[PDB]
C-alpha cells in the first residue's frame, strides 16, 4: 500500500472522457 | 513614577525629558538601594500587595533601563535588564501582570534573537507562553517576529520587506533592530546569488536589494570582494579551508585513507 | 569511605569477567 491505497487516486474520472472532446473537434 | 521621598523612582521622570546620558549615571545609586530592599526578589514573605514599592519599583526601573538601550543602540545592555526583569515577571505562572511595557520588552527580545541568528531560544519560548493563540496571532507585537522568520525561510521577500520599512510598529521601538535584520537578509542574498547565479545584471539586483541607486550595490561589492565585469557581477563561488570541525569526518583531503583504516580496525575487533 | 565508594563498582564487573571468560576459556 505504498503511495497507492493511502491517497487512492481521486482523478482521471470525468477528465478521461473529456479528452475525446478536443480529439473530435480540433482534428 | 513621580519621585517624592526618594530619588530611586526619579529615573522615570528624567526619561520623558530626554538626556539619556545623565540617566545612565543615576543607575548605580538606584541599584544600591535595591540591595538593601528585601522585596526585590520574590519569596514566601509576600502575600498580597496591590500598592507600589513591591513589584512596582522593581519592574518600572528595569523597563526604563531596557528601553534606554534601544534609543542609544546598545544590545549588550538589553540582554541584561531584560534578563534581570524576566524572572520578576513570574516564578512559574503569574496572571496578575498586565501592562503595556510587558508585551513590548518580550517582543524586542525575539527580534534580538533573530539579529544574532539564534535558533535555540527563538523556537522554544513560543510554546512556553500562557496563550499560544491570542497572544501569538491577535497581538501584533509577538506576531511581528513570527511573520518575519516564517517568511524569511519561505523565500518571499516581497511581503517580508514591507514589515521592515513601511510597517506600523517599526518606527519607534522596532527601528533599533531593523539595521541588523535588514543586514542579515542581504548577507543571505549575497550568498544565494553565488550558487544559483553565475552572473547577474545591475538593474535586476537593484529591486531585490531595495536600493535607490546603482552605486549603492557596487559599494558592497568592493567590501565583499565581488568580481565585476561590464554591467554584471561575477560570482566564482569561493569556499573556505576544508570544512567545519570533527576531524576525520568529512574534513580534510584524502578521505579514502581513513576509509581503509575503518575496514582494517573494525575487522580485527571481530575476533576480540 | 569516599575512595571505597568510587572503586565499589569494581567488585562486580571484575568478578563477572572472570566468570564470563571461564567457560569461554574452558571450551577451548
Amino acid at each position: 500500500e505504498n503511495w497507492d491505497d493511502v491517497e487512492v487516486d481521486d482523478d482521471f474520472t470525468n477528465e478521461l472522457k473529456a479528452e475525446l472532446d478536443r480529439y473530435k473537434r480540433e482534428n | 513614577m513621580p519621585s517624592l521621598a526618594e530619588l530611586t523612582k526619579s529615573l522615570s521622570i528624567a526619561f520623558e525629558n530626554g538626556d539619556y546620558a545623565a540617566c545612565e549615571k543615576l543607575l548605580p545609586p538606584i541599584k544600591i538601594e535595591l540591595i538593601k530592599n528585601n522585596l526585590l526578589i520574590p519569596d514566601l514573605s509576600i502575600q498580597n500587595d496591590i500598592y507600589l514599592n513591591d513589584l512596582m519599583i522593581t519592574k518600572r526601573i528595569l523597563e526604563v533601563g531596557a528601553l534606554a538601550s534601544i534609543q542609544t543602540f546598545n544590545f549588550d545592555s538589553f540582554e541584561n535588564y531584560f534578563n534581570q526583569l524576566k524572572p520578576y515577571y513570574f516564578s512559574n505562572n503569574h496572571k496578575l501582570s498586565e501592562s503595556d511595557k510587558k508585551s513590548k520588552l518580550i517582543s524586542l527580545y525575539l527580534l534580538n534573537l533573530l539579529s544574532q541568528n539564534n535558533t535555540t531560544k527563538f523556537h522554544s519560548e513560543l510554546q512556553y507562553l500562557d496563550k499560544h493563540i491570542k497572544n501569538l496571532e491577535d497581538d501584533s507585537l509577538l506576531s511581528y517576529p513570527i511573520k518575519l522568520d516564517r517568511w524569511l525561510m519561505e523565500g518571499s521577500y516581497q511581503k517580508a520587506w514591507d514589515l521592515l520599512q513601511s510597517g506600523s510598529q517599526n518606527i519607534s521601538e522596532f527601528d533599533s533592530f531593523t539595521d541588523i535584520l535588514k543586514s542579515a537578509i542581504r548577507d543571505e542574498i549575497a550568498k544565494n546569488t553565488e550558487l544559483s547565479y553565475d552572473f547577474l545584471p545591475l538593474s535586476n539586483i537593484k529591486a531585490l536589494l531595495f536600493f535607490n541607486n546603482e552605486k549603492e550595490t557596487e559599494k558592497f561589492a568592493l567590501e565583499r570582494n565581488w568580481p565585476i565585469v561590464n554591467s554584471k557581477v561575477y560570482f566564482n563561488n569561493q569556499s573556505k579551508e576544508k570544512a567545519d570541525y570533527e576531524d576525520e569526518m568529512m574534513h580534510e583531503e584524502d578521505q579514502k585513507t581513513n576509509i581503509i583504516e575503518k575496514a582494517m580496525d573494525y575487522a580485527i575487533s571481530i575476533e576480540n | 569511605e569516599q575512595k571505597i565508594q568510587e572503586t565499589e563498582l569494581k567488585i562486580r564487573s571484575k568478578t563477572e569477567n572472570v566468570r564470563r571468560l571461564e567457560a569461554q576459556r574452558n571450551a577451548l
Binding site: - | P28, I32, I35, N80, L85, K86, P87 | -
Partner: protein
C-alpha cells in the same frame, strides 16, 4: 529561574553591587549552576583583581562549578582559596566530598614526591592549603577516640 539576573551585575564597577551579586549565588546553587558554566571565565577573572576582596567567597562558588558538573579534579583546586570561608564541621554534601577529594590529591602528591624528599610536607613543595585541611581532619578523628583513621591516613 535563571542565573542571568545575578551574573549580569558583575559587568559594572561597584563595591556594593559586586558583593550582593556573589552572595546571592551562594544561597541558590543547585538550581543556577547550569548557566554559570557559560559565565565561568568571567567569574574567575575577578580572582586576580586586587581591589576585589570577595575572592574568598568567589573561589568557593567557582569550585562548585566543576563540583556540580561532575569533575572533581578541578573542584578541589579552586576550593583551596576560600581560606576561612571553607567550612569543616558543616558535614554537608560539599564538605564530605572536597575534603575527601583533597585526601586523594594529598596522596598523589606524596608518593610521587617521596622519592626526592620526605620533608616536602614541611617545605613549600606541597600546597599548604591541602596540608592545612589535612591537619584539620586529624584533630577531628582525635575527638572521636579512634586511632585507626587518624594514624592510618598518615601512612
Amino acid at each position: 529561574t535563571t542565573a542571568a539576573p545575578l551574573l549580569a551585575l558583575l559587568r559594572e564597577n561597584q563595591d556594593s553591587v559586586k558583593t550582593y551579586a556573589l552572595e546571592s549565588i551562594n544561597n541558590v546553587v543547585d538550581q543556577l549552576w547550569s548557566e554559570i558554566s557559560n559565565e565561568l571565565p568571567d567569574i574567575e577573572a575577578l580572582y586576580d583583581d586586587d581591589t576585589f576582596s570577595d575572592r574568598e567567597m568567589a573561589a568557593l562558588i567557582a569550585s562548585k562549578v566543576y563540583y556540580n558538573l561532575g569533575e572533581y579534579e578541578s573542584a578541589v583546586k579552586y576550593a583551596l582559596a576560600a581560606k576561612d570561608r571553607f567550612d569543616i564541621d558543616e558535614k554537608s554534601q560539599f564538605v564530605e566530598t572536597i575534603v575527601s577529594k583533597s585526601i586523594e590529591m594529598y596522596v598523589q602528591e606524596a608518593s610521587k614526591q617521596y622519592t626526592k624528599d620526605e620533608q616536602f610536607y614541611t617545605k613549600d613543595i606541597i600546597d599548604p592549603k591541602l596540608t592545612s585541611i589535612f591537619e584539620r581532619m586529624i584533630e577531628k578523628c582525635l575527638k572521636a577516640s579512634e586511632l585507626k583513621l587518624a594514624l592510618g591516613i598518615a601512612l
